[PDB]
Design a protein around this nucleic acid. Sequence first.
DNA 1: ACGCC
Length: 40
Amino acid sequence: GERRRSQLDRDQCAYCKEKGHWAKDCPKKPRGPRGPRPQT
DNA sequence: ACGCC
Ligand SMILES: [Zn+2]
């Protein structure tokens, strides 16, 4: 019962911790299928 | 924030 780990487990999304996706698949995170590099 | 690998 790790109350200290209130969020950000392995189960849940690292980025935004929403619904049932993950930080691999996060729609908030700019995973644009076009090279979403810190440049363009 | 990845990754749960
Ligand atoms: Zn997310």
